[PDB]
Amino acid sequence: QVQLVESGGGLVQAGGSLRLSCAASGFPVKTEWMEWYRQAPGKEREWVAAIWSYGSGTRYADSVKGRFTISRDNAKNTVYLQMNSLKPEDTAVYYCLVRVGSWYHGQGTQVTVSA
Amino acid sequence: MAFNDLLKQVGGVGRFQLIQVTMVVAPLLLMASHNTLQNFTAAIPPHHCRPPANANLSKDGGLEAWLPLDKQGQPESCLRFTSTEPCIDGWVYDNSTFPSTIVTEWNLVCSHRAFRQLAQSLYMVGVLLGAMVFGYLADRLGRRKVLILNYLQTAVSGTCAAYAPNYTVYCVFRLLSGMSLASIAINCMTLNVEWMPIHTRAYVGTLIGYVYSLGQFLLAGIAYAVPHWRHLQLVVSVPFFIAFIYSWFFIESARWYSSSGRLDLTLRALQRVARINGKQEEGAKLSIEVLRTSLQKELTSAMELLRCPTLRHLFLCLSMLWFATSFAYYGLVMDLQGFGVSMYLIQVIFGAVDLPAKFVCFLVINSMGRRPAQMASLLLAGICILVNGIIPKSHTIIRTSLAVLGKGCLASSFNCIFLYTGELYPTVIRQTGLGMGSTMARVGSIVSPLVSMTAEFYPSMPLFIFGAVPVVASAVTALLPETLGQPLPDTVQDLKSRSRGK
Numbered sequence A: 001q002v003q004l005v006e007s008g009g010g011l012v013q014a015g016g017s018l019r020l021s022c023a024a025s026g027f028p029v030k031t032e033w034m035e036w037y038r039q040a041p042g043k044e045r046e047w048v049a050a051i052w053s054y055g056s057g058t059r060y061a062d063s064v065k066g067r068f069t070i071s072r073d074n075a076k077n078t079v080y081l082q083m084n085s086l087k088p089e090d091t092a093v094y095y096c097l098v099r100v101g102s103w104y105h106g107q108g109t110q111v112t113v114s115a
Numbered sequence B: 001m002a003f004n005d006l007l008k009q010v011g012g013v014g015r016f017q018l019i020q021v022t023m024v025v026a027p028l029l030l031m032a033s034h035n036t037l038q039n040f041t042a043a044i045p046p047h048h049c050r051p052p053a054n055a056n057l058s059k060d061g062g063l064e065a066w067l068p069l070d071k072q073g074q075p076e077s078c079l080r081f082t083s084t085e086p087c088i089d090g091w092v093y094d095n096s097t098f099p100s101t102i103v104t105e106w107n108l109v110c111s112h113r114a115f116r117q118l119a120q121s122l123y124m125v126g127v128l129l130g131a132m133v134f135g136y137l138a139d140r141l142g143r144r145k146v147l148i149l150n151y152l153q154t155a156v157s158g159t160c161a162a163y164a165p166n167y168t169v170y171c172v173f174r175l176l177s178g179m180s181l182a183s184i185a186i187n188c189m190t191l192n193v194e195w196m197p198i199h200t201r202a203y204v205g206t207l208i209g210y211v212y213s214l215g216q217f218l219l220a221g222i223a224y225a226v227p228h229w230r231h232l233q234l235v236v237s238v239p240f241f242i243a244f245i246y247s248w249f250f251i252e253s254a255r256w257y258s259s260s261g262r263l264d265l266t267l268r269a270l271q272r273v274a275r276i277n278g279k280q281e282e283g284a285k286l287s288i289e290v291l292r293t294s295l296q297k298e299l300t301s302a303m304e305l306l307r308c309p310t311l312r313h314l315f316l317c318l319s320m321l322w323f324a325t326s327f328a329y330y331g332l333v334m335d336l337q338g339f340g341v342s343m344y345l346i347q348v349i350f351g352a353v354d355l356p357a358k359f360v361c362f363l364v365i366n367s368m369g370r371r372p373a374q375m376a377s378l379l380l381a382g383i384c385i386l387v388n389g390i391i392p393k394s395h396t397i398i399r400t401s402l403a404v405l406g407k408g409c410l411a412s413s414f415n416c417i418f419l420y421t422g423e424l425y426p427t428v429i430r431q432t433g434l435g436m437g438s439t440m441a442r443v444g445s446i447v448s449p450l451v452s453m454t455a456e457f458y459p460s461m462p463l464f465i466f467g468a469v470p471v472v473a474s475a476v477t478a479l480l481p482e483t484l485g486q487p488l489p490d491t492v493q494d495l496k497s498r499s500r501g502k
């Protein structure tokens, strides 16, 4: 079986920065896709960002450019998120997805942007 | 004293040789339109999985939650989220530019997307089957009768394909449409060249090419006017019906009539052609006793072609050339949706580029020769479409210009290979050689959709195969001798002497 456990939640004031990552097990992170989603309360799943395999490319959404940064590593076989200048509308539960239209999605982390 | 003697005696420029020729070559416009139509009647519009009706779109934050996205900012065209799972509730197609296409009607997307190209493959299978079977039937039975039958079958198959309930019905009716269409295409040319003197065959060929280019123009315009596929197929097939209604005034081929060993009806046809031409004083002397005295010298296949080593080698080479040229040409023509620009404009440019390319190859063959023209045209076409395959979608104008140059190069290559096989094969087996070359060209046009079938592997590999084939053909056709000096061999003895004497 494949695990996609993740961690990096916390309570932090607006304009701070967190440390988010997905612990990928059973597959090399450099060989498949990667994606990112949030489900803010009162809203639905929203696409955030994606990084291809072997660093082919990385594209963002309208509220991700210039604010968030996502990187990868090979030693720990994980995908890591960095962010700054957080705003109250960013309060959401973030879900890690291994591939587009893929059956392997993580448990999710709860991150709060307290104005 | 021969058939040409009588034909010149009756005329050659009179009203008959214009009216009959123009009537029989009018449907070549729809020839081109029907051959290319699959591009316009089966264009894939942007599409995505449909969220289930039970789910509330308003309460789920819109359709963006149920549709995973790809790189180009569009929803995924085959998958959907489970709150994954493939399409199970159908599909959603935008109507911004396509009211309806066969892919829109019968959801030939994601899984079982092969059918939108299997349809063209089956149509080309029908073309080849009709060509060979109805060539045999025309040899056995006649020309006017088989051409009329092809007219009717084409019209019926076009209408039936326009109104097709299922998909297998559509494929079978396309197969029968090709069955009739190859036969009409070959028989129009054979009747025109059999009812004209020797020194007008080049004129007939040039007119056929001009009508084909005008057919490309007409298809572009008719696609601009009528976007709906159900209306488009019917509107492009009903003029065949009106031409079948008005094509009962055709005059059968007198040469084939004389070739049957019987001459009374041949005399009747020649008398009729004298009446319509308006020249009766000169045609009065025509009677039975002059037919035998004028037509007696000429009265007196695969196995022999494959037996002789020189004949076998010449076959293999020419078959490879025809196969590669037709394969690449139809692979390039059948795919114009993925060029960025509107299909109508690129189709217009493809049609327009025919005449300048024809002038270029004519100048080259009348100036330098044929084999260098083959090399240049094939190599340039292969390189151009390979670069098209290697240039990403982000660039549009350069890709379209490269595709236009490639289409022009393929047209010039077609004209050049026709002339080269005309002035290459010995007169003993020249007609059978042309038939085999045409059959191999139809085989290549059959395979081309099969090659484009497997684009699921790589995004642009079919373009790579289309660009790899003609470079191989040009490399392997190097050994072929050049016939600029007009040797015009008759039997296999001349070929070996000419090759040794070259």
Ligand SMILES: C[C@H](Cn1cnc2c(N)ncnc21)OCP(=O)(O)O
Pocket (backbone or CB within 6 Å): B028, B031, B185, B186, B208, B209, B212, B326, B414, B418, B441, B442, B445
């Ligand atoms: C002058 C052309 C030469 N030729 C012979 N075969 C072909 C194919 N398959 N495509 C285009 N052109 C071809 O024939 C008249 P047609 O294509 O059937 O209107």
Ligand SMILES: [Cl-]
Pocket (backbone or CB within 6 Å): B131, B182, B185, B186, B438
């Ligand atoms: Cl043909």
